Amino acid sequence: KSDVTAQDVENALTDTSKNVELTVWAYSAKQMEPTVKAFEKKYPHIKINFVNTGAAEDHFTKFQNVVQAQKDIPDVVQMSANKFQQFAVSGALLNFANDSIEKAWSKLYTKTAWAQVHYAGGLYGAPQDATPLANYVRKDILDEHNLQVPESWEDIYNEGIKLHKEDSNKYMGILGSDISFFTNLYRSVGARLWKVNSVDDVELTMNSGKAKEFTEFLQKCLKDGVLEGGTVFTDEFNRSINDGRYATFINENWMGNTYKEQNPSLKGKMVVAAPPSWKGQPYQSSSVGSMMSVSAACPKEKQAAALAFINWLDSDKDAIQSWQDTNNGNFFMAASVYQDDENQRNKKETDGYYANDDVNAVYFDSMDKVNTDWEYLPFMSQVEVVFNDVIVPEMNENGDLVGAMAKAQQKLKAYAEDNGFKVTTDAD
Ligand SMILES: C[C@@H]1O[C@@H](O[C@H]2[C@H](O[C@H]3[C@H](O)[C@@H](O)[C@@H](O)O[C@@H]3CO)O[C@H](CO)[C@H](O)[C@@H]2O)[C@@H](O)[C@H](O)[C@@H]1O
Ligand SMILES: [Zn+2]
Ligand SMILES: [Zn+2]
Ligand SMILES: [Zn+2]
Ligand SMILES: [Zn+2]
Ligand SMILES: [Zn+2]
């Protein structure tokens, strides 16, 4: 049980005679590093060795490698709310839960994000960004085809048929072969793939109920040309999203900043809209986001400073402002100083990039509608492996996503059983 209190954390910042060196690994270096530099300017006794680990997939592999070796482990490591679980459960991350941290830091982060940095009763990071889904819509393409900005999945299907019949070089959307992209869609329609009761007790529902109905719908979209299966955040995707291959793109809202940075030619052409409803339920959403975690290997005498750094970077009012100023005037932060500020909710676009200037209001409404009735499995790294091996190959116009989900569930059941988890599935 961690005895580093909220007061001990604050003392690491005030006790400036106690010099500390922290090694920090991050994959979102572009967005985060300027605010890291601001930390170092403000607290020169805490020196940050900031390591840009490149792409997230490489970062997580590198971190697992050093943890398994028990050598050369960073003190602080970027995590995300749907990838940290297997690191937390395996003991790679410091569980810094205690009453005083819980009491103090729970007030600093919006409740949806704060819940998600817990796992199995431990506390494993400070939330960084929230990532409510938004639908980035090429309004120019829809206008050309006399199509409305879609508000539901039913609209995506019916309008997507018309679009692709009239212009077979464009699709209404992409079904991205990425575990976050894919699970975000299920979460955003209230379709549980699984339920976690405790660290060693899980239920898989990948082939029944609302999940099965949604999978059937996605396969019909693939079969009929409404969605195209493909990768996201690859060169293939980058070409497509620049060329207008997808009239809609339903994604975590950090993409809103990515378009401003990588796609200047799309200025004025997109509207940012709410993600779609399903079956005449009110629309729901999903938020994941990054978090900053401390390694279990972090030396005891550096832990207070490591926690002080993660809390400062992710919640200090100056830090939150830096996140805005260094990311085109907006970055969607989980800290309550951002989330509870009506002027962030009503913040108007000033750069002319999106065709609607109320982008943050769309993001905030989506955040309000995040589906919190959800947990990630303890072995999310294995989930991603099985997804790549079993589900991704079926994401095509002749695929069988329904059958693939059932086979993936069987593989995850065997993995769970082999690793000491109690597991039920809807196939039992
Ligand atoms: C790993 C993801 O972390 C969160 O998303 C962050 C987003 O991550 C992207 C990486 O920067 C990129 O290298 C590659 O791995 O794609 C990732 C998206 O899946 O990066 C932005 C900045 O551009 C933010 O830092 C996001 O927090 C999380 O929300 C995702 O679901 C993933 O777990
Ligand atoms: Zn150093
Ligand atoms: Zn708690
Ligand atoms: Zn067209
Ligand atoms: Zn390629
Ligand atoms: Zn400050």
Side-chain angles (χ1 to χ4, degrees):
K1 189 179 180 177
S2 178
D3 56 15
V4 181
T5 67
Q7 175 67 271
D8 289 331
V9 173
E10 291 199 357
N11 291 340
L13 300 179
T14 70
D15 296 352
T16 70
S17 73
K18 304 180 65 69
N19 297 281
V20 173
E21 304 271 332
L22 299 173
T23 291
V24 174
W25 287 10
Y27 56 91
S28 301
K30 172 181 176 53
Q31 293 80 19
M32 188 198 308
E33 186 168 358
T35 305
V36 176
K37 294 181 170 178
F39 174 88
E40 298 190 274
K41 192 182 192 173
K42 180 62 164 47
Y43 298 111
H45 71 287
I46 300 168
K47 284 176 175 171
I48 305 297
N49 170 38
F50 186 76
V51 179
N52 180 351
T53 53
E57 182 177 8
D58 294 328
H59 172 94
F60 293 115
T61 299
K62 291 170 179 173
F63 185 65
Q64 183 47 208
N65 290 333
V66 295
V67 170
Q68 286 171 0
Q70 305 173 332
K71 295 178 185 66
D72 218 336
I73 300 170
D75 306 307
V76 172
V77 60
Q78 186 180 353
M79 281 282 141
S80 77
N82 67 1
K83 309 248 190 316
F84 82 100
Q85 283 80 8
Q86 203 164 319
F87 294 100
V89 171
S90 70
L93 300 181
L94 179 64
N95 171 8
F96 58 91
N98 63 45
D99 297 336
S100 69
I101 294 290
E102 188 77 36
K103 182 186 186 66
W105 294 24
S106 67
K107 297 168 176 56
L108 297 177
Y109 300 99
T110 202
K111 65 184 159 65
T112 290
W114 188 243
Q116 289 194 129
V117 296
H118 289 76
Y119 205 76
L123 178 60
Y124 292 101
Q128 190 162 90
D129 56 321
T131 70
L133 304 185
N135 190 351
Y136 295 93
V137 175
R138 284 286 299 270
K139 179 78 155 46
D140 57 327
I141 296 174
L142 294 186
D143 286 348
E144 170 72 3
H145 289 273
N146 308 117
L147 303 176
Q148 195 159 312
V149 171
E151 306 166 22
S152 66
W153 274 112
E154 291 85 353
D155 294 338
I156 288 169
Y157 181 92
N158 293 315
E159 297 179 46
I161 294 289
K162 180 168 184 293
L163 174 63
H164 190 71
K165 289 174 61 70
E166 299 172 2
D167 187 348
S168 58
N169 188 234
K170 297 186 181 308
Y171 288 85
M172 198 69 179
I174 186 167
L175 183 64
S177 53
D178 174 86
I179 191 63
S180 286
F181 184 93
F182 186 82
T183 61
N184 279 341
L185 298 185
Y186 285 74
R187 180 170 171 192
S188 73
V189 299
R192 274 187 170 274
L193 295 168
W194 48 69
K195 188 182 285 178
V196 182
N197 301 319
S198 70
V199 78
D200 63 352
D201 186 323
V202 305
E203 302 175 5
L204 307 184
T205 56
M206 293 174 64
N207 189 41
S208 60
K210 267 268 269 194
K212 186 177 182 185
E213 188 178 13
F214 194 58
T215 304
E216 288 169 336
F217 171 77
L218 291 176
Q219 190 58 67
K220 184 171 87 163
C221 285
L222 289 168
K223 182 175 73 62
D224 290 352
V226 167
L227 296 176
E228 184 182 38
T231 57
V232 288
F233 323 125
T234 55
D235 69 87
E236 286 68 28
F237 180 76
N238 297 338
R239 292 197 305 275
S240 290
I241 213 71
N242 201 76
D243 299 343
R245 189 167 182 81
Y246 303 117
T248 73
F249 183 49
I250 299 162
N251 197 80
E252 295 184 2
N253 74 337
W254 50 262
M255 184 70 193
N257 190 65
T258 301
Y259 280 120
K260 294 190 179 192
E261 285 294 309
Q262 303 186 357
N263 301 100
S265 69
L266 300 181
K267 176 172 190 178
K269 300 180 189 169
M270 285 183 283
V271 169
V272 185
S277 67
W278 176 232
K279 299 182 72 184
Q281 316 166 158
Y283 90 85
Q284 301 175 244
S285 185
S286 181
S287 181
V288 180
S290 295
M291 51 201 282
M292 296 301 279
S293 301
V294 179
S295 64
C298 183
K300 181 71 194 308
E301 72 265 20
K302 289 190 194 193
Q303 289 181 181
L307 290 166
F309 170 74
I310 70 177
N311 206 29
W312 188 95
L313 176 63
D314 298 296
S315 72
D316 184 83
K317 283 183 294 288
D318 294 290
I320 298 306
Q321 186 59 45
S322 177
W323 278 96
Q324 311 309 299
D325 294 342
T326 64
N327 294 286
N328 303 296
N330 191 56
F331 217 67
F332 200 82
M333 305 309 290
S336 300
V337 293
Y338 182 100
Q339 291 290 315
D340 295 345
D341 181 354
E342 299 303 309
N343 286 20
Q344 296 291 1
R345 177 178 296 259
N346 296 316
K347 183 162 73 181
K348 296 302 174 178
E349 300 293 281
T350 60
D351 61 13
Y353 190 83
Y354 292 113
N356 60 314
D357 65 2
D358 65 336
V359 170
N360 244 29
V362 174
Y363 293 162
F364 267 93
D365 193 70
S366 183
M367 185 68 178
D368 289 346
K369 309 293 176 55
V370 166
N371 179 16
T372 61
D373 197 7
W374 187 274
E375 310 79 43
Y376 293 96
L377 288 169
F379 40 85
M380 283 307 296
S381 306
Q382 188 65 14
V383 171
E384 183 166 2
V385 169
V386 172
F387 171 81
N388 284 337
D389 288 336
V390 181
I391 296 164
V392 168
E394 297 295 343
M395 296 182 167
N396 66 67
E397 54 194 347
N398 302 304
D400 175 30
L401 269 176
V402 171
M405 292 292 276
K407 284 191 291 192
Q409 182 169 245
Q410 291 175 314
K411 284 202 134 61
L412 291 170
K413 179 192 181 180
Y415 180 87
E417 292 170 336
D418 287 357
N419 289 269
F421 295 86
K422 302 170 194 182
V423 55
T424 67
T425 83
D426 62 31
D428 294 357

